[PDB]
Design a protein around this nucleic acid. Sequence first.
DNA 1: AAGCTTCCGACCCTTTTTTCGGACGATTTAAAAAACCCTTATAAATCAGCAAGTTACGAGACCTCGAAAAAAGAGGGTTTCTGGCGGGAAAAACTCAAAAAACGCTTCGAAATCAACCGGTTATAGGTTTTCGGAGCTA
Length: 98
Amino acid sequence: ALTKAEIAERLYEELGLNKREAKELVELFFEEIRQALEHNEQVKLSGFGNFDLRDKRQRPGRNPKTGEEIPITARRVVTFRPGQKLKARVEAYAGTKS
DNA sequence: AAGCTTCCGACCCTTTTTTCGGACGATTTAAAAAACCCTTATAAATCAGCAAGTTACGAGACCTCGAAAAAAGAGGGTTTCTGGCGGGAAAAACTCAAAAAACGCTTCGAAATCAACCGGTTATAGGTTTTCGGAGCTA
């Protein structure tokens, strides 16, 4: 996978900023994004998809391997909407399903 | 013959060196004064241990003044440590702008989903061991 260690490496390589502080830079950006959504502060991005929080309603659930049914409680969960610029970048590649 | 300049003699005054005289000290010599010796039988001192009464010399204490040593106070200076202010460069906010990029309209039909539980994936927090950089060092 792509890893924030690999971001720290890329940031050293391409910008030249030392990896020690680069790792803290990425992890702080990755922490403040969490702080925003944790506060229910919708995070809104352009040139990139963005971060919404959806209040899901009561839904039927199951044990898929037994067929037992369990209710799914209403909940607020984060939902990220890819943008058309990102979709256009991602639409086609390689030759196998993902 | 006259004027200028330079020696020379006469003198005036004070300081520096030498000589002489006088005074004082020290030593020597002589003269004067105090003292020593020789005659004494009789009177007074010698002394033995201890008691009873007294004190001349020593010790303790304090004062007094003066001086000496130490401590403090003063002044001269140099070295350095810090603070304030001023100046140039970089950063980042501030101002100005375009071009994307998102959002909405607006989706009926296609995913997304959660739930519990198994096995499996793997990013990486954390720790462990080690090159690179710099310490300067030395002429």
